[PDB]
Structure formats: structure tokens, C-alpha cells
Design a binder for these strands. Structure first.
Lengths: 797, 87, 81
RNA sequence: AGUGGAGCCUGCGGCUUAAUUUGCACCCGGCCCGGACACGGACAGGAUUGACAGAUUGAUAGCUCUUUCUCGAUUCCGUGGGUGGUGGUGCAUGGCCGUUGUUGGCUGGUUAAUUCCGAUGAACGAGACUCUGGCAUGCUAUUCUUAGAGGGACAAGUGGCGUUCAGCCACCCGAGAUUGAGCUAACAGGUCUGUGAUGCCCUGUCCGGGGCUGCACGCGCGCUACACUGACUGGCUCAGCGUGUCCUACGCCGGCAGGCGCGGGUAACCCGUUGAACCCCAUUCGUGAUGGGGAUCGGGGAUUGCAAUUAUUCCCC
């Protein structure tokens, strides 16, 4: 009942009682209670003052502590001597605690440290735990490390239940030790590994874990000493399947090998292949946890200890000498781990091969093909459950290795005329489709163009000969291997020289080959989306855009077709092209629209091309286009008005460039036109127009309130428009428009009150517009939540 | 407890009877549905101590019967009140 | 929109019996949906067409060996009758 | 291949028995308590309550048999074909559970160990039911009004996030990428102290001992054998399904049942490379109710349990 009180020692003693007399802190209380700690051995009152001085002592009286450390120390030695002669627990525990505080804050100091250290092997748990935590706090808060390390070594050498306590001591104190004492302790823990007891083994592996986990410097652990620990600790390998010490063994090996690689990378990579061989050998254990631990261990070692230093290693062949030969041994071990003897860990082994592919395929390509052939042979099993894992492995191998080297290793047997029709390597084309990202395009040309032409001709010849079964198979084959082009256009390295060899091919395949067209369009888009990083590449793409653009325009404008993919390709491929040909095509499209001898479908297609060409032109072309499209906003055709409003939205969409300059030059004319054409706007045309209005809100000046208060009812009636897109646009326009009133005045709340009282009459008129205005207030209430002012909200409620 | 202690049939003191009739007058204008056992308690009281009830107590229990009736046991209380010989 | 059971099981069986006559785009899927199955509900026919378009854009990216043996099995079943 | 033959064991009948329970229920003894209503009796001359000691008892005991000390209306005797209440049971009956997503947040002793016991919070969202609209310059008596049918939209396409598949977001086109109508509910699982002067039918606990097939017989499952394709003795060499904080390794003692100590195993880790039996090899036995066959008996030792007697079980002769 009294411990939980705020006035008790739980909270307030730690805060306000440390200020002894108003100033923190004074040890005059401590020095005044000497008459209680002398000649009085009463329990439960010594404990209380000991607890109080333990809590008070932490608030740094450091120069006073340095001065009267002798007084405190002699007081403490008489306290421990009297209490050890008496045999109590609580008073000893907090006098150990205040020893910890005093020695952390600060010849006789070694004596105080020895007195604190000597009570650790005391059989009472409360004395021992407090002594352990105190020594840990003193050392980590060092000239006293040698003494406590020698004490621990002699305590082990003299000695069966205190060994685990002082192994926990060594576990918590190994990083803060000098190198010779670390070597002596390593010898001592190996000497206790000479025994067969399990708990001492687990605690010594935990000590080695805490040593290798902290990543010690050169003064604590050297590379030679780490190598000696690694080679000396190989002697145990408990049996194969113990599962309690094996995980700790693998754990200290990964941490020791990581530290060895961090100290000296060539020596660590030299010692690693034996560790990989032992890991592969212990993958035969029947326990799944050993498999998971080994998988994670070898994966993280390959990710952190091998991959960043692989570029320094360079290319490796079959006749390597240095660490490249070590990498060859690494791969030899993990490839010998692909045999039949596992047959249950093949998912983990395939994960290891996949991460090794991703780490080192590009620099290990000469020697790394035999395992590719072996895993190709593994997929020929009648019932393989790791088909997805094997496919991911081949995908990583294609990504890093490159499909040219893979096809040198495992060639496709679909080269022209086959006697059978049961393709055993038909998964390679989906793998190459899914996982080519960084391979040269010239390989794709010189290997996949004539083969595609011959198989397509063979499919046509078999279709015209009556056989409709094999022809469909060959058509599916060729259509799948034409989908490799988006993969090869991901990050090409020679697209500055190899794109010239595919320009006319892609032109004819997009003109008179419909079955490829979408993919070709996608390929083009995919290329742009990650291929215009350099400048010569973009120059080549523009130089061929001057040829592709009439072809794409004629493809989109033809009567009936994948018009939307062509439209998206045209949009991006016009955003990456030069402005003069944009102006020329804009002139041609304006001539085609203004020509009265064109059909309605052709007119709408050329208006879509005008929509595409609008944001990429200069200010004069955009201005003359706006002058041409301005009478079209009052047209009775809903499609023409919709395309006109989409043009006005697209030219106002650019935040910078000629479009923004055009808007800044023609804002008044745009406002008058949009207010005049408000009376004659069709129902679909509301959906783009609001966005156009949105595109002139977020830079609207302060002298434009009449335009906004004229636009209010249109925005509300579009918040309850038929189309959900128009509703979303009107809601976003309301949010941005309320944001626009957050810039016209100093008081945000008053401005939003004005914005509300501009829309408050909407709760008065016709039933449908009342519902419209309630929906508008519902949307506005969720965005500017507190800024309306709750009482006003209450009135609305 | 009321029903069984009235079934004890002891010589009832009259302050006790005043307390009981004061309790039943306390149950005058309540609209809660009284149980069948409430009417059983009333029946036991008017069976045992009908002679010790004065005329005003008789009529007071009469409008207590009127406002809080029972389709089954109220006529029994009616005939016990109407055939009661006072002291 | 979430998916049901009947549309997709009907799509699965209609592929398992007539995978040869399907196409790649939505309109050909619609056309084979009228000309193969009666499908009195127009909503169900539209959903079947959408899911079979999803199936044709999904399975055509896979291995060709399974497609080839499935065409052999379908041609054998057609020739047997 | 047998069973039906023989010995033993067991299941139904039957026979004995106090009981040999039945389709711990059984038996032999000893405790505890067992309405009010009506009427007639005793009752402050005292109704009735508690009690030491001794004894009866297989044992002790104010729960009994003596001897008087106390408490006093808190009462106790008898007769009713009169109800009945700590009763059992069904119905209507009111409340209450479970049922048909998402993101956060240490005084004490004790152990190898942040080991053990011991004191000791928040928000966000929520029809996958049926029908169906926008646009038709199309068919029908038809671009402006009609009303039948046929189309059209299905997340179909794009880019991101995604277990790379379910799904999510945004966008182009498109009239339509979701606008309108109808549908909470349900308890054969129930629960919780309330309502009907609710229908019915009546007015045991603990303790000690025994028995639980005791055996003339009838009807049936089984085990072991009637031997030479065998019994004894030694040697040799092979499993599998499972289980285990009672399975057990190992060392010592005893000839054997078995004791003592010290380890492993919460388990493909230890028993356990499960060193099994038939079988194989070698010895003795010689057609003899015999070295085949083992029942029933006499003595001794050990183990499990409060307890082994009517033999719990095991070992030896």
C-alpha cells in the first residue's frame, strides 16, 4: 500500500531527495550515518540506509568522491568484513551496489575492485547477481581488465556450479579485455571444452558469441588470433544432430568469420571454404532448424563478406591463385551440395545457389556453368517439388550471369527444325523473359531475330500444309520469345550502337505484325522507362523517334486494335522527343482536325493525338492550339468538347516549361473562356474540365475571388456528378481550392470561415443541390478537421 | 419469510400489524407486476389475522385489492375480508 | 470487386474442354463465350470473359511443353469422337 | 490349420452361499437425522440444551449404559387415509454468452541463466445477397416523345505496392470503373434464480470386516501338449510397428529372483547398429505316459503396496 505511493522511495526519492538541503548532492548524510554503520549490527535498518545511499550516490558528486574515496572505501571494507562474518544478504547486496556506483564514478582502487570482485563467487544469488552487474557496470563505465581476467582464469583453473557463473562473467566481459588475456581465456575455455559437460559447453559458446558479436578492435582481437580460434574450434562438431550446441557452433563460426573478413578480407575468404564444406556436410542433419540456421548463415556471409569485395577479386577462371581460387572452392562446395544425398534440403540449397548467382555470377562466369547443367538435369525429374525454387535460381543466374553465357552453358534445343515436339528446356524462355535486366541488346538481335523469322515461317508453312497442332505450338514459341525484348530493353549497355539494328525491324513488327504489337509497344515503353539515363541513348531514341512517330500516329488513327497501349507509348515517347518535330506534328494534326473531309472517328483519333502533342510543344504552338481549340468548347458534340477540355487540362498540367508560361500569359483569357463555356458543358466533359480548373487553382493569385465564387456551384454539382472520376476531381478541386484560400489571408480560420460561408447557402435551395452541399461539407469536414472551429462544426451538425 | 412467519400463527402484536399494513399501503400506487406469492402472502395474512384488523384496515386492503387485482387469488382475499369478524 | 466460385469453376472447365479455340484479347474471349456456352446471364458471361482473358494473359507466359502436350491430348480427344 | 478329446484359465446357465452385485452395484454389524396442520396429554412444582469420568463396543462416543451439574419455553408425546416439501419432472415465460478484419503499447527467497514461484493500455474500418440506370442516330409499330427485344463494362488496359498470387492504389479510353430499389435477423448449443394459487408422481451419510465364481454339471471362446519334422545343452546370426519421467545404459554384490551408486532420455539425440523367437550348426536322449507333458502340492528367498490369509507376482529345490 505504501510502496506504490508517489511520496515513497519508488519515484520521489530518485528525484527530489538527491537534492540534500536544496543542492544535489551532499554526502554529509552518508558521513553522518557512520555512527549507525559502526557498532550496530541490527538488520532491516542497515538495509534501508544502504538502499537510500545506493539510490542517492548515482547523482555524480565526483570531486567529493575522488577526495573522500579513502573514507568511503575503508567504510565499505569494514562493512563487507562485518557482514561476511555475520552472514546477511540485503545489506551486502546494496553495499555491493554502492561499490559499483562509486567505482564507476571514480593502488587502493585495485583493492576496492578486488573486494567487489571477490563476492561474485558467493553462493547467494542476490549477492552474486549484484556483484556481476556491478563489475559489468564498472568495467563498461581499462586498467582493471587484466586483474579481473587473471582472477577469472585462476578461478577456472582452481576448479562445478560456480564455473557457469564465472563463464557468464567472461561472457559479459570478453570484449573489454587485452589481446594476451583474450588468448589466455580462449585457451581456458578450450580447456573446459576438453570436458564432456553440456552446460559449460553452452555457456562457453555463449561467451564466444558475446566476444565475436561486439566486433572487437585490433587491440582486443587480432586477425591471427581470430584465425587460431577458428582453426582450434573445428575439433568439436558435436556429432551431427545434437541441435542444441550445433546452432551455437555455427553461430560462433559465422560471427568469427565475419570478424576475420572485417579485419583482413583475403585471410577470411581463405578460411571460409572449409566452413562452407562443414556447413554443406552438416546440411545432412535430420533437424530442420540446423538447415534453416545454416541457410541463413551462408546467405548472410555471401551477402556481406563476399559481395562487396568481389569487384576487388575480379574474374575467376579454373586456374585462379589467390582469393579467386577460394571463391572457386566456395562454388565447388555449394555445387557438390547439389547431389542426390540431400534430397530434402534442395529448397535451401537452391536458395544458396540463387543468392550465389546474384552475388558472383558476373565475375565467376567461366567456371560456374557445370552446376547450371546439373540443375538443368535436376528439372528432368518426373516429380520435382522445387520447380519454383529452381526457376528462381535460373532467373537469378540469367540476371547476373547473362543469358548469353547461360545459353552457352545450357543451349536451347528449339533451333529451327526438331524431330520431336516435347521441348525439355521450354522454361528457359519464361525465365529469360522474367529475369533479363542488364544484358546487351546485340545478343538479343543476333540470336533471336533469324530464329524468330525461321520459326514463324515454319509455323506459317505448317499451317498452310494442314497441320494446325504444331503450327500453334511454334506460334506460341515465337510469340513468347518475342517477349524477351522488354527484358533486353531494361538496362542495355550498348543501346547507343545496337538500337540502329532494330529500328526498321520494330517498325515493320509494329506496322504489319499485330500479334507482337502490344509487347513491342510495351518494350518501347519499358526501354524508355529505364533506358534514357545517358544522353547519347536519348539522342538515338529521338533520332529514331523522327521515324517512328508517323508510324505510331498511323497505327493509332487507323479504323477497326490496342489503341490504349499505343496511346501510352505515344505519350511517353513524345515526352522524350524534341520540340520542333512536336510542332510539325501539331501543325499536321491541326490541319487534319480542321479539314472538313474527315470522319468522326478519324477526327477523334487526331484529337487524341493533339492531346498527346499538347504538353510537349513550345509556347507559340500551345498558344495557337489554344486559339484553335477555344471555339470547340461550345460544340454540341460531347466527344469534341471532351477532347477540347482534355487539351486544356493537358496544357495546364505542366508545372514548368512552355505550358506554365502560356498559362501565365493567358490566365485572363482562360478564366473568361472557362466562365463563358460553363453554361454549355456536357456531362462527360465535366470530368476533365474540373482537373483543368484544378490545374489553375494551385498558382492562382489573390485577385481572383470572383472566379472562384462563380465556380463554386459547378464544383458542388460535380461532387454529385454521374461519373465517379468527375466526383473525385471535384472533391480534389474542393480540397485544393480551400488550400487556395489558405494563401489569400493571414488568418487561416477566418479564411476557411469565408470559404464555408461561400458554400453555406447550398443548404437552402433545391433538394438535389442541398444533398450536393451536404456531401461537399462532409468531404470538407474530413480534411481541415480542427481548422473550422468545433463550435461552428457543432452548428453545422 | 412473511408467508411462513404468518403461517406460524402466533399471537401477533399490534405494532407489528401496523407495520405490516403500513408496508402494504407502501405498495399502493406501484405498477410493477406482483407475483402469485405476493397474493399468497396477502391470503395468509387475511386468513390468520382477519380478526385483529379494524374496519379502516379492511377497507384499505379493499382498495389495495381494487388497484392491484388478481384473476385467481383476489376473490379469496375479497371473501376473507368480507367474512371477517373483528375483535 | 471480389471474386466468386461459379464463374471461375465454369471458366476452368471451359478451358479444360476448349483451350484450343480461345484467343488472347477480350473480344475473342467474348465471342467464344457466346458460341460455346449458352450462359443466359449477361453479368456471368461478362465475368467469365474477364477471367478467361486473365487466364489467357497468365498461362501464355508459362512453359510451352505443357501447352504442347495439352494440345496433343485435346486433338486426340477430338479425333477419337 | 484346427476347435469339439485332456489339464489350466475364462464367458453365459445351473449348484452352494449372508453375499457369491448387475444389465462396488452385493452381504454382516455400528453412527447420524426423519415435517408442519388439527385434537388430546406433560411443562416453570419446571419442558428441554450441553457435559467430565467409567463402561458397552471389532474400536470410541453425552451420537448409546450409569452418576448428578448446568441451559431454561429456545418445548416434546400420541392419533389422522387431511395436506405435504431442502422433493423429481414438462410447458409458456424475462435477461445473458458463444455462434452463424487492421495498426500501435520488483521487498523476498530460487536457478547455469532476464530460471522458479512470490507482490504487481489504446485507437481505425466494416452489405462480397437479387434486380438494375447513364450511351444507342442499331431491329421492331422510330434521328426529337414512346415500349418489346438486341448491344454496351467485365476491373478490360496502363504504372507502382504486393508471399510475385490473391488483393490495394492512381490513371488513359470509355456514357457508365459503381447510381439506385428490396433484404436487421436466428438459437433444435444453451445459460442465468423470475413470472402461471402451471400438469403430473411420492412424503441417505460415514465406519470395520467379507464376497466379487466359491463348483456336481450343461453350452462356448482361449493357452499348453499328446513327442524323433522332437525335448535338453552349447555355439552362430537376422526384424518391424510403437512407447517412455518412468524407459533404461554402466559399475559393484548375489546362483536366481533381485539390492546399492552414478549417468542419458520431454525423444529419429538415450535405451537402440531395438545383438527377439522360430531357424541354422554341434552334443545327449531312443518308441518307453520316457530326458515328451506340465497340472496339483511341501519348504525357502525377493519385490509392489496402509494390507498379499482363500496362495498379487517372480525365483530355487
Amino acid at each position: 500500500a505504501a510502496h506504490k505511493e508517489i511520496c515513497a522511495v519508488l519515484a520521489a526519492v530518485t528525484e527530489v531527495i538527491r537534492s540534500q538541503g536544496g543542492k544535489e548532492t551532499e554526502t554529509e548524510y552518508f558521513a553522518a550515518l557512520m555512527t549507525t554503520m559502526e557498532a550496530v549490527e541490527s538488520p532491516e535498518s542497515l538495509a534501508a540506509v544502504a538502499y537510500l545511499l545506493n539510490l542517492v550516490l548515482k547523482r555524480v558528486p565526483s570531486p567529493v568522491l575522488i577526495k573522500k574515496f579513502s573514507d568511503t572505501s575503508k567504510a565499505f571494507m569494514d562493512i563487507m568484513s562485518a557482514q561476511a562474518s555475520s552472514g546477511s544478504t540485503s545489506v551486502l547486496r546494496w553495499v555491493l551496489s554502492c561499490l559499483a556506483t562509486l567505482l564507476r564514478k571514480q593502488p587502493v582502487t585495485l583493492q576496492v575492485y578486488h573486494g567487489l570482485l571477490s563476492f561474485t563467487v558467493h553462493p547467494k544469488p542476490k549477492i552474486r547477481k549484484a556483484a556481476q552487474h556491478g563489475v559489468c557496470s564498472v568495467l563498461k563505465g581499462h586498467p582493471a581488465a587484466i586483474s579481473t581476467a587473471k582472477f577469472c582464469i585462476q578461478e577456472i583453473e582452481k576448479s562445478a556450479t560456480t564455473t557457469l557463473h564465472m563463464l557468464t562473467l567472461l561472457k559479459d566481459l570478453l570484449p573489454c579485455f587485452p589481446e594476451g588475456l583474450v588468448k589466455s581465456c580462449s585457451e581456458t575455455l578450450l580447456r573446459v571444452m576438453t570436458l564432456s559437460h553440456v552446460l559449460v559447453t553452452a555457456c562457453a559458446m555463449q561467451a564466444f558469441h558475446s566476444l565475436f558479436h561486439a566486433r572487437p578492435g585490433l587491440s582486443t582481437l587480432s586477425a591471427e588470433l581470430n584465425a587460431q580460434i577458428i582453426t582450434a574450434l573445428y575439433d568439436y562438431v558435436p556429432s551431427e544432430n545434437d541441435l542444441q550446441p550445433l546452432l551455437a557452433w555455427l553461430k560462433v563460426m559465422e560471427k568469427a568469420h565475419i570478424n576475420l573478413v572485417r579485419l583482413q578480407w583475403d585471410l577470411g575468404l581463405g578460411h571460409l571454404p572449409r566452413f562452407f564444406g562443414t556447413a554443406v556436410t552438416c546440411l545432412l542433419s535430420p533437424h530442420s532448424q540446423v538447415l534453416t540456421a545454416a541457410t541463413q548463415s551462408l546467405k548472410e556471409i555471401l551477402k556481406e563478406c563476399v559481395a562487396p569485395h568481389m569487384a576487388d577479386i575480379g574474374s575467376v577462371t579454373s586456374s585462379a591463385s589467390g582469393p579467386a581460387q577460394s571463391v572457386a572452392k566456395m562454388f565447388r562446395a555449394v555445387e557438390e551440395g547439389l547431389t542426390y544425398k540431400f534430397h530434402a534440403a534442395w529448397s535451401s540449397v537452391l536458395q544458396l545457389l540463387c543468392v550465389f548467382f546474384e552475388a558472383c555470377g558476373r565475375q565467376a562466369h567461366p567456371v560456374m556453368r557445370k552446376c547450371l547443367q546439373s540443375l538443368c538435369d535436376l528439372r528432368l525429374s518426373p516429380h520435382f517439388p522445387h520447380t519454383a525454387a529452381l526457376d528462381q535460381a535460373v532467373g537469378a543466374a540469367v540476371t547476373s550471369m547473362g543469358p548469353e553465357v547461360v545459353l552457352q552453358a545450357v543451349p536451347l534445343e528449339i533451333d529451327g527444325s526438331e524431330e520431336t515436339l516435347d521441348f525439355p528446356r521450354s522454361w528457359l524462355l519464361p525465365v529469360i523473359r522474367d529475369h533479363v535486366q542488364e544484358t546487351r541488346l546485340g545478343f538479343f538481335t543476333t540470336y533471336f531475330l533469324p530464329l524468330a523469322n525461321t520459326l514463324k515461317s515454319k509455323a506459317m508453312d505448317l499451317a498452310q500444309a494442314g497441320s494446325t497442332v504444331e503450327s500453334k505450338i511454334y506460334d506460341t514459341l515465337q510469340w513468347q520469345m518475342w517477349t524477351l525484348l522488354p527484358g533486353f530493353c531494361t538496362r542495355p549497355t550498348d543501346v547507343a550502337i545496337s538500337f540502329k539494328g532494330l529500328a526498321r525491324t520494330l517498325g515493320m513488327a509494329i506496322s504489319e505484325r499485330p500479334d507482337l504489337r502490344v509487347t513491342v509497344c510495351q518494350a518501347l515503353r519499358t526501354l524508355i522507362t529505364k533506358g534514357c539515363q545517358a544522353e547519347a541513348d536519348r539522342a538515338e531514341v529521338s533520332r529514331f523517334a523522327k521515324n517512328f512517330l508517323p508510324i505510331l500516329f498511323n497505327l493509332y488513327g487507323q479504323p477497326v486494335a490496342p489503341r490504349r497501349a499505343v496511346l501510352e507509348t505515344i505519350r511517353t515517347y513524345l515526352t522524350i522527343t524534341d520540340t520542333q518535330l512536336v510542332n510539325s506534328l501539331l501543325e499536321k494534326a491541326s490541319e487534319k482536325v480542321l479539314d472538313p473531309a474527315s470522319s468522326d472517328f478519324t477526327r477523334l483519333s487526331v484529337l487524341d493525338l493533339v492531346v498527346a502533342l499538347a504538353p510537349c510543344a513550345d509556347e507559340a504552338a500551345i498558344s495557337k492550339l489554344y486559339s484553335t481549340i477555344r471555339p470547340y468548347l461550345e460544340s454540341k458534340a460531347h466527344g469534341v468538347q471532351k477532347k477540347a477540355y482534355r487539351v486544356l487540362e493537358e496544357v495546364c498540367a505542366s508545372p514548368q516549361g512552355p505550358g506554365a508560361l502560356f498559362v501565365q500569359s493567358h490566365l485572363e483569357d482562360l478564366k473568361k473562356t472557362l466562365l463563358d463555356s460553363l453554361r454549355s458543358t456536357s456531362s462527360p466533359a465535366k470530368r476533365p474540365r474540373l482537373k483543368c480548373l484544378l490545374h489553375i487553382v494551385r498558382k492562382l493569385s489573390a485577385e481572383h475571388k470572383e472566379f472562384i465564387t462563380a465556380l463554386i456551384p459547378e464544383v458542388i454539382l460535380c461532387t454529385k456528378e454521374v461519373s465517379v472520376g468527375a466526383r473525385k476531381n471535384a472533391f480534389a478541386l474542393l480540397v485544393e481550392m480551400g488550400h487556395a484560400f489558405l494563401r489569400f489571408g493571414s488568418n487561416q480560420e477566418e479564411a476557411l470561415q469565408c470559404y464555408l460561408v461561400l458554400i453555406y447557402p447550398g443548404l437552402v435551395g433545391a433538394v438535389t443541390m442541398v444533398s450536393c452541399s451536404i456531401l461537399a461539407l462532409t468531404h470538407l469536414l474530413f480534411e481541415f478537421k480542427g481548422l473550422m472551429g468545433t463550435s461552428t462544426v457543432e452548428q453545422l451538425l | 419469510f412473511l408467508r411462513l412467519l404468518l403461517d406460524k400463527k402466533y399471537a401477533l402484536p399490534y405494532r407489528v400489524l401496523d407495520a405490516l399494513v403500513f408496508h402494504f399501503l407502501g405498495f399502493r400506487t406501484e405498477k410493477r407486476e406482483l407475483p402469485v406469492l405476493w397474493h399468497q402472502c396477502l391470503l395468509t395474512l387475511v386468513q390468520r389475522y382477519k380478526a385483529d384488523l379494524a374496519t379502516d384496515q379492511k377497507e384499505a386492503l379493499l382498495e389495495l385489492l381494487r388497484l392491484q387485482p388478481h384473476p385467481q387469488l383476489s376473490p379469496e382475499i375479497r371473501r376473507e375480508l368480507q367474512s371477517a369478524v373483528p375483535r | 470487386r471480389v471474386r466468386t466460385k461459379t464463374v471461375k469453376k465454369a471458366a476452368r472447365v471451359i478451358i479444360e474442354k476448349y483451350y484450343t479455340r480461345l484467343g488472347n484479347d477480350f473480344h475473342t474471349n467474348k465471342r467464344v463465350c457466346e458460341e460455346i456456352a449458352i450462359i443466359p446471364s449477361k453479368k456471368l458471361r461478362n465475368k467469365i470473359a474477364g477471367y478467361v482473358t486473365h487466364l489467357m494473359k497468365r498461362i501464355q507466359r508459362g512453359p510451352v511443353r505443357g501447352i504442347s502436350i495439352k494440345l496433343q491430348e485435346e486433338e486426340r480427344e477430338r479425333r477419337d469422337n
